[PDB]
Amino acid sequence: PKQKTHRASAKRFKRTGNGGLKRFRAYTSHRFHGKSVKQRRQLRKASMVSKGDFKRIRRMVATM
Amino acid sequence: ARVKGSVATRKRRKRILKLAKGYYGAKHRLFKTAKEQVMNSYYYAFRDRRQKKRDFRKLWIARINAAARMNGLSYSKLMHGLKLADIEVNRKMLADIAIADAAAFTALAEEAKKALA
Amino acid sequence: ELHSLKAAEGSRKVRNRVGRGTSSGNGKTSGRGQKGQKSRSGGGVRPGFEGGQTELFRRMPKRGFLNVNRKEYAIVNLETLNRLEDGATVSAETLVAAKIVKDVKSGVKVLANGELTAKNLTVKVAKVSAAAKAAIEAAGGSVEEA
Amino acid sequence: AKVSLFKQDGSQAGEVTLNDSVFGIEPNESVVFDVVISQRASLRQGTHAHKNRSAVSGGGKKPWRQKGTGRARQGSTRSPQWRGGGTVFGPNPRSYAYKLPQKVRQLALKSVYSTKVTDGKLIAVDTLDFAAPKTAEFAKVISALSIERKVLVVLPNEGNEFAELSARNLENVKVTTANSASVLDIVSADKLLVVQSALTQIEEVL
RNA sequence: UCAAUGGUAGGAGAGCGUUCUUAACCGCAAUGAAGGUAUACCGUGAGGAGUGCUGGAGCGUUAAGAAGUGAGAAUGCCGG
RNA sequence: GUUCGGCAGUCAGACUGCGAGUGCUAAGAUCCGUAGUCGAAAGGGAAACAGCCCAGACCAACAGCUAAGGUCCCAAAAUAU
RNA sequence: UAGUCGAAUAACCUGGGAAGGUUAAUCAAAGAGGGUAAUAAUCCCGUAGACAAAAUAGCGCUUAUACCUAGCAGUAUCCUGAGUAGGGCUGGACACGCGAAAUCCAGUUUGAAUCCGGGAGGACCAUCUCCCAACCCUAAAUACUCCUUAGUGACCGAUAGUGAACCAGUACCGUGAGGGAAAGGUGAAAAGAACCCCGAGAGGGGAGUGAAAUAGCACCUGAAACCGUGUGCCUACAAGAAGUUCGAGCCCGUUAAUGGGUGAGAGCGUGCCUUUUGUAGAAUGAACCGGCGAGUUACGUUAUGAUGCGAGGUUAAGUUGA
User: Fold this and answer.
1) D112: nearest CA in chain C?
2) How far is the CA of B8 from the C1' of G17 (A)?
3) DSSP letters for D106-122
4) List of residues 6+ apart from B69 with CB closer than 8 A
């Protein structure tokens, strides 16, 4: 019928208009001992999604 | 819309078999060995569109060194005298003078004699 | 044109009869090359698949719960106020009788962007941004929010 | 403009209150054959069926077992390749309808409309609503200019009834109103008579 | 005029042929439709008609649409 | 050439040298880098030959010239100097 | 549920036969469709319309009857749906996988209040909103057709179309449950071949039949593999993917063409398919011939164009209607 949007994938992602998606950081949940002082200084924030990868967007994250 | 085009299909069959006719025995009494049998034949008819070139030229140069060798002349020094010779570097009509040309053959040979000379 | 029905460009082109013949072929192959999981029937492959490794999205943290009481106002530009002059009592009746958007999130809001062509004060709102309150309220407006 | 205003064909050579509003344009024939393809199959019933091996059958059991016993890996005679032929993907009970948006529909009427305007094979006709329904009447009124190949017949929207409960045996007569409009209406006949109420039989939506 | 034209899986473009298409356009048909058969034509190809003969009812045009639509080959199947 | 967008397939190749590794510095053996070749590229040469060498084919053609390689006969050119 | 009437035409040419071609005329609520020896509006069935049923199964309208209801202010107290709500545990359904878990329904256990009442408002405690369970019935709009016709087809033409156009669920298999085939067409009309002759008979052959007898009872049309019979050339010193190309020589004369059929001889030539790195293959596979026999659509998204209008595009479902 319709194409079912994966709601938990929507809980993974958040994309922008005329632009890419915001991807929160890896590693940032479970232990914090061995990750560095600088990695604590910088890995609260995170960067965007890839370019040549992530083209498996289609269309598993439809219209959310 | 369960349609067939049956007579059209057999007209392709008929078309290639009528164009396949002539070869040995069972082949037109069957279908598919005949299919290569025209086909291989003009594969190397395509090669013999280059190789009766390259064998009628062997007849050309061979018979002209046959008559040159009848004048005791070898093809390589004859042709060498042909590049030494005149505006004529004419080849295979000069092969065609094997009929009855002591004048054209032996005299053009003498032109080559005054070309090596 | 029923004598000589003709078609124009672009609307029509041959639907590619894929899987017959010798030229495009594609029934021998369908673009594919044999002897593989790709090379079979069904089209059976899940899209997100790191080869049995967990996926990109499968490595994501669970971020941010969602307000059930999330509610907005179907925000318009002030560029439509550049369209309509003055439309005294700029409200939802001016908005949907202007037919800008009909199904609206209950209120209305304008940007400071868009221009101060309108003259009327009594703009009936639920909530306009204070950046636009600088614009119209410094440009002959009155606040009637809700 | 001026084409007809005939009280009968041949009997009053006058104007046409078309009106000469927007009708005079480029007739977009792209849009035209779009309406011939979408207006086409608006009466395709499409009731051709489709079947399956699992639709009609007698056999859901393998008829031997393969190993050593001659032939190949094999489903059944009920598997389609036998005389018990299952269709592969075939037809289906499908519909075929679509209708265009309004502005390209009225644009499409006002394309062939315009072609009939400058063509003038439409002729403005009065009522000529007759006593009997007999078609010697309309045989000699329609043949009183005798447009030969095939003709559309613009009634009023009050529903004339005498060429209309008849003239279906008149082999070129197409009984029509303002509630008849298509391209299979008009491009079909290309040659037509008018009831001169065609302002409030044409303009009112167009 | 110059330059290009090996080409598989690959990708793009274009065209042929079959059948149904109410469409029309517009004919053929017993002096012979279709279909078959021989054929020493043409078309780059797929393909197209000419004639001879069988044969005695539907078929062809054009253009466009729609397709169970283009046949060797699978222990393919069925029938011989 | 970049960028953007569709659409692919390719995952396992050999072989020839050249430089490595392992192996009896055995191998038409493996495993690298490096070029070519085939694969997916006819024709010619080496007796046939996918891999070596030369030479990349739209087609006609009863044209010539030439690459390597050949010129006592098959089998063409030098019983050449 | 029986059916009834029901309009509108002649000749010539052709042929075995006109409705075909030709010449003319008519009709009109009927030029839908089907037959007719060959394609019909005017030949027929019919068709459009217009009539017809006692019995027949109904539908619908009018009639009093075929019977139980109302408002209304006040509130003496009663009532209003007890193992009932609930609570424990075990379940389940609810989007709800025990969860913060609502809410409902089960088993089991415990067990109220009852109009100052009680319940719901996703644990729950207050305020507010709404309702009154724990008693029963409720058409309508909906689902699907074995069926009854009225039918419609860009359904399908005898491997299709129902397994089954045919005495099909037949034959037949199997003890059984089950399975499960094959096959239609003469000719208009059998007018089906009187007779005569051969022949044990069949079958043939003459005659005659019919437009036609290659048309003769599985009969329209008749390939294809298979078997032939005749035919011009060549081959009994030859060891070929069975070929080209050239061609001695022979024979014949054509979609009239730089003709064809040959072909001695001579050069050079490893079948086709999937897979593979590479197959000529001693890697598969194919007896042959013909028929069938495989990338769709339903809905959705994306991309690309085409068209339309444009910050304005857009009607879905539905209604109307053929």
Assistant:
1) C1
2) 35
3) HHHHHHHHHHHHHH--E
4) none
